[PDB]
Design an enzyme around this catalytic site. Sequence first.
Site, PDB file in Angstrom:
ATOM      1  N   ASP A 123      55.197  51.166  48.931  1.00  0.00           N
ATOM      2  CA  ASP A 123      54.510  50.130  48.561  1.00  0.00           C
ATOM      3  C   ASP A 123      53.720  50.276  47.242  1.00  0.00           C
ATOM      4  OD1 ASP A 123      53.698  47.603  48.726  1.00  0.00           O
ATOM      5  OD2 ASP A 123      51.806  47.953  49.820  1.00  0.00           O
TER       6      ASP A 123
ATOM      7  N   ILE B 275      35.879  47.691  47.078  1.00  0.00           N
ATOM      8  CA  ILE B 275      36.864  47.861  46.070  1.00  0.00           C
ATOM      9  C   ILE B 275      38.006  46.759  46.061  1.00  0.00           C
ATOM     10  CG2 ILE B 275      38.757  49.627  45.420  1.00  0.00           C
ATOM     11  CD1 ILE B 275      36.593  51.693  45.804  1.00  0.00           C
TER      12      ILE B 275
ATOM     13  N   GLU C 286      39.280  60.693  46.701  1.00  0.00           N
ATOM     14  CA  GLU C 286      39.079  60.697  45.320  1.00  0.00           C
ATOM     15  C   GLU C 286      38.785  59.384  45.082  1.00  0.00           C
ATOM     16  OE1 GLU C 286      42.028  62.274  42.996  1.00  0.00           O
ATOM     17  OE2 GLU C 286      41.036  62.107  41.098  1.00  0.00           O
TER      18      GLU C 286
ATOM     19  N   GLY D  48      43.375  46.555  50.825  1.00  0.00           N
ATOM     20  CA  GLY D  48      44.816  47.242  50.800  1.00  0.00           C
ATOM     21  C   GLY D  48      45.557  46.854  51.976  1.00  0.00           C
TER      22      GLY D  48
HETATM   23  N1  LIG Z   1      39.800  46.300  40.251  1.00  0.00           N
HETATM   24  S1  LIG Z   1      39.052  47.488  39.863  1.00  0.00           S
HETATM   25  O1  LIG Z   1      39.573  47.896  38.347  1.00  0.00           O
HETATM   26  O2  LIG Z   1      37.640  47.142  39.570  1.00  0.00           O
HETATM   27  C1  LIG Z   1      39.096  48.920  40.936  1.00  0.00           C
HETATM   28  C2  LIG Z   1      38.130  49.737  40.713  1.00  0.00           C
HETATM   29  C3  LIG Z   1      38.362  50.968  41.576  1.00  0.00           C
HETATM   30  C4  LIG Z   1      39.317  51.102  42.456  1.00  0.00           C
HETATM   31  N2  LIG Z   1      39.609  52.092  43.109  1.00  0.00           N
HETATM   32  N3  LIG Z   1      40.471  52.031  44.227  1.00  0.00           N
HETATM   33  C5  LIG Z   1      40.584  53.373  44.940  1.00  0.00           C
HETATM   34  C6  LIG Z   1      39.835  54.451  44.630  1.00  0.00           C
HETATM   35  O3  LIG Z   1      39.170  54.720  43.698  1.00  0.00           O
HETATM   36  N4  LIG Z   1      40.494  55.450  45.312  1.00  0.00           N
HETATM   37  C7  LIG Z   1      41.444  55.137  46.210  1.00  0.00           C
HETATM   38  C8  LIG Z   1      42.087  55.632  47.045  1.00  0.00           C
HETATM   39  C9  LIG Z   1      43.117  54.797  48.091  1.00  0.00           C
HETATM   40  C10 LIG Z   1      43.161  53.527  47.730  1.00  0.00           C
HETATM   41  N5  LIG Z   1      44.080  52.487  48.141  1.00  0.00           N
HETATM   42  N6  LIG Z   1      43.562  51.374  47.516  1.00  0.00           N
HETATM   43  N7  LIG Z   1      42.806  51.587  46.594  1.00  0.00           N
HETATM   44  C11 LIG Z   1      42.545  52.844  46.745  1.00  0.00           C
HETATM   45  C12 LIG Z   1      41.433  53.505  45.955  1.00  0.00           C
HETATM   46  C13 LIG Z   1      40.214  49.955  42.469  1.00  0.00           C
HETATM   47  C14 LIG Z   1      40.397  48.920  41.796  1.00  0.00           C
END
Ligand SMILES: NS(=O)(=O)c1ccc(N/N=C2\C(=O)Nc3ccc4[nH]nnc4c32)cc1
Length: 283
Positions: free
Chosen positions: A121, A10, A75, A13
């Site tokens: 942050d 994903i 989630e 972070g």
């Molecule tokens: N760029 S994108 O639009 O394709 C895109 C798609 C999905 C997500 N999801 N991220 C997270 C998620 O579902 N739950 C958490 C929990 C803590 C976190 N910390 N950092 N990220 C997360 C995420 C992020 C970016």
Amino acid sequence: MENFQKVEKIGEGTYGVVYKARNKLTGEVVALKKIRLVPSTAIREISLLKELNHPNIVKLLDVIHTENKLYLVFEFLHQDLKKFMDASALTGIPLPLIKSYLFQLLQGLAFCHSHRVLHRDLKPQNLLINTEGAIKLADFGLARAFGVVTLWYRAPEILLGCKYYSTAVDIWSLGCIFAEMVTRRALFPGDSEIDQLFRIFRTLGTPDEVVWPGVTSMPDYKPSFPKWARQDFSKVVPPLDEDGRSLLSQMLHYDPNKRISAKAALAHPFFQDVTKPVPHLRL
Ligand SMILES: NS(=O)(=O)c1ccc(N/N=C2\C(=O)Nc3ccc4[nH]nnc4c32)cc1
């Protein structure tokens, strides 16, 4: 960790890499964060975050401490605000949707802040959206639990070396994000700590003892900072109306004590006509 099948990365972070994964037993689709280093205080603090549920907070489902490694199970949501703002760059996010998102994020901050939990942050990459029009804050409380790179959303008190910052740091970051949704450009895109600080000063004016009592005694304050005049918000966030500019000015006060709280911001006249529109999301 054998109970999870990784689907895809994903992102990377602040505290570790996030993966989309499937829970092999339940069939649940989750976000799995592998924390990069485990200290006992971090386990206890993270464990308290599991109890912190709100509709505008990304749920921390589980803490997995195995083989001296730490995994956080969250989630999953399908898109972040960064990708959504990039997709909406040609037309802009409609004002009713920016307002709904700001209102929901303030509800999330008000909740965490009432439990003495700070984010520290906030950035578009940790604000997640779904098809129903909801927006949720991810990673609240991780900065305090783990201790210690985009500087764009950092509050001036952090940049000036305040060690004991408050809930006001999240209001500052959210104000910056609100301006970015409106204008389709980052408000303060600094590329070093001093460039970040000076970009803030060039817009809002170099702070002094009048606007921020105690500023000149701050750890990283230098009397040699150039003295810039403040700019009008009408130039800063056009075409945002007077209610939006007034709210933003309150979210961007220099003095953390004068800066509006999330609870007081929810009462601001800007939200008199708030609604919950459905975004057009391409997944
Ligand atoms: N760029 S994108 O639009 O394709 C895109 C798609 C999905 C997500 N999801 N991220 C997270 C998620 O579902 N739950 C958490 C929990 C803590 C976190 N910390 N950092 N990220 C997360 C995420 C992020 C970016």
